[PDB]
């Protein structure tokens, strides 16, 4: 019901209160800023979520490499430090059952199954298209999903709340980082409980929004 | 049946053997070893440090030297343990000067004595080490995945000071590393699946 207006656009959302701050902090400024230029929520392509859907992952800023106004400043400047506000809203009726785990994995090293070969460039950075979990039970990094709750996360249940809002500050060892090289965070939606319905197969869309709030840029060129 | 020790400082800090090597020495008529002193080799310390993302600590290196027998008796050798920091190129023309350059820190110790103990400070460009690095090495655009050029401590180089000694004894060197002043950030899930390779996170299952 409550609309969240940031910049020149906005998206109808559920009431936003007591939103999750990752590790109990918010993306403050480093002790020009894009509160206008690149501000508004960038809505990615809605993924079709079915009963046999393993999951999806979008690294930050992998899905944002070229998006709208933000796609220009990626290759334009030398360094940046940016926070992220991620709002994942999944619309469904009261007759659908299931659960979706939206968790942000800082510093996610992916992996492969039953081989020692390291993934290539196209396998790691997929751009806006995003990837699909090969084995979501092991998270693809070799760890376990049961203890994966240690990260910041929110629960989307078709009973209680159909949306989630996660705020990610700047997490890095360096004050700034390289746009096309290192991925600080990772956005993952994990369907712990699959879909179920009266019909054999249904389709539940998922909307994902990411706002690069309170960031900076240096090294002007081009 | 029926918080002091639970602290992270006491949890991550323990004495473990990160390098085990013994070079065969009988008759040469060379002898040395160098290694990157990384925590991904020893399996118990790896998973011990896979729990956390970024780590800040000062490595404390202790070299223990034992001499075996392949009654003569054990002579006392003089050994030199030199630490080579990252950025020093190694064009090895052995028998001549690189080891003895005054830039690199070296230490001399005998066989019978308290074990040589040195404390390596924190050397990094960034604020802390990166155990999990999502990205590629440098900017090669296809550069190596999973290895961050920003964090490399260096190579630990150890050789015997004395010349060839006519014995058939094998020298065994043990290097223990106990970190101190440990600061932790971003705890992660443990990895139950075995380690296929130390170069990346691939799992078998």
């Amino acid at each position, epitope marked *: 019901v409550l609309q969240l207006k940031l910049g020149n656009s906005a998206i109808v959302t559920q009431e936003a209160a007591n939103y999750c701050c990752a590790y109990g902090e918010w993306p403050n400024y480093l002790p020009t800023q894009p509160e206008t230029a690149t501000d508004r929520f960038y809505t990615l392509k809605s993924v079709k979520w079915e009963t046999g859907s393993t999951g999806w992952w979008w690294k930050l800023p992998d899905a944002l490499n070229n998006i709208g106004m933000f796609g220009q400043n990626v290759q334009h400047h030398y360094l940046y430090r940016s926070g992220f506000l991620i709002h994942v809203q999944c619309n469904a009726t009261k007759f659908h059952q299931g659960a979706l785990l939206v968790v942000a994995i800082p510093e996610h090293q992916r992996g492969a199954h039953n*081989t020692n070969t390291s993934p*290539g460039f196209d*396998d790691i950075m997929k751009g806006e298209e995003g990837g699909t979990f090969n084995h979501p039970y092991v998270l693809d990094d070799g760890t376990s999903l049961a203890c994966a709750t240690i990260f910041p996360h929110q629960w989307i249940n078709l009973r209680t709340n159909n949306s989630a809002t996660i705020v990610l500050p700047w997490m890095n060892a360096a004050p700034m980082d390289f746009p096309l090289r290192h991925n600080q965070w990772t956005l993952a939606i994990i369907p712990v409980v699959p879909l179920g319905t009266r019909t054999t197969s249904s389709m539940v869309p998922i909307t994902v929004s990411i706002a690069p709030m309170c960031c900076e840029f240096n090294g002007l060129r081009h | 049946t029926v918080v002091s020790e639970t602290l992270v400082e006491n949890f991550l800090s323990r004495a473990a053997l990160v390098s085990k090597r013994s070079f065969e020495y009988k008759d040469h008529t060379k002898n040395f070893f160098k290694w990157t002193i990384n925590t991904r080799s020893f399996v118990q310390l790896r998973r011990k440090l896979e729990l956390f993302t970024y780590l800040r600590f000062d490595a404390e290196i202790t070299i223990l030297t034992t001499v075996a027998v392949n009654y003569v008796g054990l002579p006392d050798l003089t050994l030199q343990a030199m630490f080579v920091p990252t950025g020093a190129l190694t064009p090895e023309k052995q028998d001549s000067f690189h080891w003895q350059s005054g830039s690199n820190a070296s230490v001399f110790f005998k066989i019978s004595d308290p074990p040589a103990r040195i404390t390596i400070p924190f050397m990094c460009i960034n604020s802390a080490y990166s155990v999990f690095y999502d990205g590629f090495a440098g900017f090669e655009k296809n550069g190596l995945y999973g290895i961050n050029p920003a964090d490399t401590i260096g190579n630990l180089c150890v050789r015997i000071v004395n010349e060839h000694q006519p014995v058939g004894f094998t020298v065994t060197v043990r290097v223990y590393m106990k970190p101190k002043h440990i600061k932790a950030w971003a705890p992660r899930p443990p990895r139950t699946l075995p380690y296929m390779s130390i170069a990346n996170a691939n799992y078998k299952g």
Partner: antibody
Amino acid sequence: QVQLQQPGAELVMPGASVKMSCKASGYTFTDYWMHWVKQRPGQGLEWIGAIDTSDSYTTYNRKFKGKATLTVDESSSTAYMQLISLTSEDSAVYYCARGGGGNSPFAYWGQGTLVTVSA
Amino acid sequence: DIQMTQSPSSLSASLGERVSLTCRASQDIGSSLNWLQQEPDGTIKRLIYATSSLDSGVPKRFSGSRSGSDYSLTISSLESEDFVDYYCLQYASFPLTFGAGTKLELKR
């Protein structure tokens, strides 16, 4: 006991592209990777891509991206290769390898196919 | 893609006269490398994998060593059937690439 079989030639004109069969025997097909290697008459070895048997996860080269399509079948324990819009430029001898957990090696190879296209 | 430089591209040797082929990589692939034998009939067969390790059933004349900046394939004794196309491959990371190759010739 264990071998690989990819017999035949199958020359074809442009407008459609033939799809490879790679069949394996002697080992459990579900637990091992499947690779592909392209031998060009110009002595090119250029590698095509790899596919997982369990999942549909694949990896493609930059220059070969959007062309090659990999699919496998665990029922018949075979492997398929699907191309699109082959022209008079592409001709080569196709190979399919296995790999594994360790070394992901090339140890087992096929006989090879003769692909010659003309306008 | 990471390129594997194989040199020399050709050589001429007689029976015996052990000769090693050296490959160089712009990036560090670790201990993971493979060598492949290519017969004139079109059948490829593996020879050397993971440096010192060798294939079961292949005679001991094939060997390898590493100076740490390079990868070498050493053959103790050559033969009349030992004329093939050798290639060095890196399976450590995707994508997998092939070397330049060397065509062995006989002095006549």
